[PDB]
Design a protein around this nucleic acid. Structure first.
Lengths: 365, 49, 87, 346
RNA sequence: GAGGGUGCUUGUACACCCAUAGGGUGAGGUUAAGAAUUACACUCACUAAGUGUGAACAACACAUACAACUUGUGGGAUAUACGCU
């Protein structure tokens, strides 16, 4: 059977369910330590999965030897004394064990070793640098760690343990959207994948990869929706005699450029601000515009893609076609304004995943 | 080329017989007009039907 | 001049994406419909088969199948416009 | 107590000094092959150096430190790739890893690798006959048995001056790099230049003017610097005035009867702090003015009246107004001889 | 008045407040000066923000409308402000 689901991720805010401040602070400091150990881990794994391939290259330049990544107990040309993922997991666990859990290590190991084999093609020739993982990384945790999930009606919040620590979940005023999603797991009805966790300065967030299913509508494959995307009109869609124009040049491009201009304004004004206390306090005002316009662009892109999908479904357009998109990509590539002010890859990927969810088949030409 | 109808054409009502352009009335070129022409272009070239 | 050029880029580069759309070449798609494109269009519109199924049946790549279908739709639209103009 | 010699980097264009197109083509091919060999050598050297440094964490396999790796890479790429560049690269990587090995072991930073487009290094021994040529207008030299003439193009920047001092020996050269970005061969030269003791030279004139959105403007020779910008100076002023307005509105609607001082101390202080703001503003502005004066060895600085009448002026009020706002003139006078420059009158 | 805090996340606006937060400071290194003292786009860090209960800078309860809600990780690339020539 084919994959009847499309992967999906949700953000759930979590508070530490403890009575006093000091225990909460101890847990939060432990989790910050978990972040630091995870990032140092990711660095260790990527270095340790770079070096051995170059040892292979060294041997091949020595005598053309056919050394390959395999256990020597199972391969004559193998050099490894165990499975490669085991080698990385060992060389990180032997140093970072006893401080942060090992499921984080397993999830990170899988997540990097899966991608590095695909990147082997770009790494033998050389067009990609070894990743240098950040410090604010959302660290990953597998489904083998979620435990004691229940709905405590007394505190009006779901309770669970993220590796031996209580956690009251803060849906807030979300009594419908994700409310029947965690209950869909406490009763064993929805599948969950290896999730991640973020912490952004006092608040705690869980990036849960819930595996959601497709939605079947009454769609006609013969009916075709003609979609075009431009910087003056973000979406213009034909469906027989029905026209829909989604987005305005002022609400997408002009506000984006206004945020950019405000950022440049603060950058200019930070040169002569309070001085002598370091660069960080000078760039404090710049730090406000961290992901401002990215968030704005993402929200407007979500709204526009949702309106496009709603229009296509409401008119039973079973095939959505992007007109002349290849040529517009070509012109955007050989420009500056069009690439750095018209997010078309983000729009295209949102449309693709929101139409593969609804059954609409998307064509580009 | 000279804006003159061809021999053999049918003169339906409202068709142009001898097209002509007359130089339009440019007043003093105020700075606002200068900028508008500089950025948009000379779409309103100085010629009246 | 630089400020004028930045205002020009703000005004007209947002309209240059649609300027090519309004200036699209009127390609004379009056030629006979190719067998592969016709089969793809018949499968998608009449047989109601997914494009993946069409690719599996015709041993063609998904991108190539999509391009052929879009070409078929283009020349059918041209033919329908020509028929409407002549009727 | 920083180093008395500053390090600069310049990217010039270099062309092969061979008359016919064919010879230039083989030399370009040889440069590309050299870059490929250098890429492979750098990769292998860094990998095995990390391998040898991290031996106790390398137990998952089955079975000075300079010399071993250098010898293997030398016998790997001898003849096709002159060993001087290889040795220079090897020394460079062993020095850099010594620089950040502490953060290597802690894992704070990954292993910096190389790409196909990294500028391969070379020292001084590669370059010979570093002189200047006027007949063909190109500072010519000879790198690795190959003569080399630079196509500087329409280079009106300081690159020509830097090259002129470099060939004459006035400026020492460090380990530089060669890049093959987009066919046009480029040379990334790192110069170690002794910081000359800058002293007051009273024969240059510095031109200080008030403006409308570009506050204090200072011009000297081919150099210009602006001290601040209009919205920059006005942001805190607007914030203070608006905050004073809302504080006054809140106080007038607040609980009275507890004393007028308790009601209006913040109201008075909010207007008061504007004066300190503008005082510190004039202070930093004069500081940057004197900083230019000292920096560019200017001996005489003069501030225009630059007042005119009607024209464009008399409608806009000038940022920093006239040359006496909050004793601005005085704050550049007392500061002037504080540094030594001669600010007279204009 | 921008910008913000609480009102699950994002966007808009919204009630209540904070907001000279593009500020008020603390420490370490360094520099300059006879000193006071100044300086650093040098480094690190702290400090403001709904209502009620509550001795409380403890904890708990309560707190607006519409739309959206597949993200995370990394690489390549470009540009902005600043510093040097």
């Amino acid at each position: 059977m084919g994959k009847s689901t499309l992967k999906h991720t949700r953000k759930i805010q979590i508070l530490i369910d403890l009575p006093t401040k000091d225990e909460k602070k101890e847990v939060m400091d432990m989790m910050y330590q978990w972040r630091d150990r995870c990032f140092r881990a990711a660095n260790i794994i990527v270095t340790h999965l770079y070096v051995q391939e170059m040892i292979k290259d060294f041997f091949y330049l020595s005598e053309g030897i056919k050394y390959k990544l395999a256990d020597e107990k199972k391969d004559e040309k193998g050099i490894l004394q165990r499975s490669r993922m085991n080698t990385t997991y060992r060389v990180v666990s032997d140093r970072f064990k006893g401080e942060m859990p090992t499921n984080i290590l397993s999830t990170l190991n899988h997540g990097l070793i899966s991608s590095f084999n695909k990147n082997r093609v770009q790494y033998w020739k050389g067009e990609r640098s070894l990743p240098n993982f950040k410090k604010d990384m959302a660290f990953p945790f597998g489904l083998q760690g979620i435990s004691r999930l229940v709905y405590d009606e007394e505190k009006k919040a779901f309770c669970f343990r993220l590796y031996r620590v209580p956690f009251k979940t803060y849906l807030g005023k979300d009594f419908t959207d994700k409310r029947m999603l965690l209950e869909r797991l406490v009763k064993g009805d929805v599948k969950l994948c290896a999730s991640n966790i973020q912490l952004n300065g006092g608040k705690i967030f869980w990036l849960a990869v819930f595996e959601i299913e497709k939605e079947k509508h009454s769609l006609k494959p013969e009916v075709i929706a003609e979609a075009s995307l431009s910087l003056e009109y973000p979406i213009v869609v034909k469906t027989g005699k029905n026209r829909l124009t989604i987005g305005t040049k002022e609400e997408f491009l002009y506000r984006r450029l206004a945020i950019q201009a405000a950022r440049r304004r603060t950058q200019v004004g930070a040169t002569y601000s309070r001085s002598g206390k370091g660069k960080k306090r000078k760039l404090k005002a710049v730090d406000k515009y961290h992901k401002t316009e990215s968030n704005y662009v993402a929200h407007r892109i979500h709204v526009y893609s949702r309106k496009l999908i709603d229009f296509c479904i409401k008119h039973q357009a079973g095939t959505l076609i992007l007109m002349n998109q290849e040529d517009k990509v070509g012109i955007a590539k050989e420009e500056e304004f069009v690439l750095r002010n018209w997010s078309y890859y983000e729009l295209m990927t949102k449309i693709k995943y929101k139409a593969e969810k609804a059954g609409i088949e998307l064509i580009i030409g | 080329e000279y804006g003159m109808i061809r021999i053999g054409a049918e003169v339906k009502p409202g068709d142009i017989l001898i097209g002509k352009i007359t130089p339009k009335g440019e007043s003093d070129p105020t700075p606002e007009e200068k900028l508008l022409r500089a950025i948009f272009g000379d779409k309103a070239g100085d010629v009246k039907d | 001049k630089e400020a004028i050029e930045d205002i020009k880029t703000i005004v007209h580069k947002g309209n240059e994406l649609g300027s090519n759309d309004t200036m699209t070449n009127e390609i004379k798609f009056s030629g006979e419909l190719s067998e592969e494109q016709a089969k793809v269009l018949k499968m998608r519109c009449d047989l109601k088969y997914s494009f993946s199924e069409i690719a599996k049946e015709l041993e063609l790549s998904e991108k190539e199948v999509h391009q052929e279908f879009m070409k078929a739709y283009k020349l059918m639209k041209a033919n329908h416009q020509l028929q409407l103009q002549s009727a």
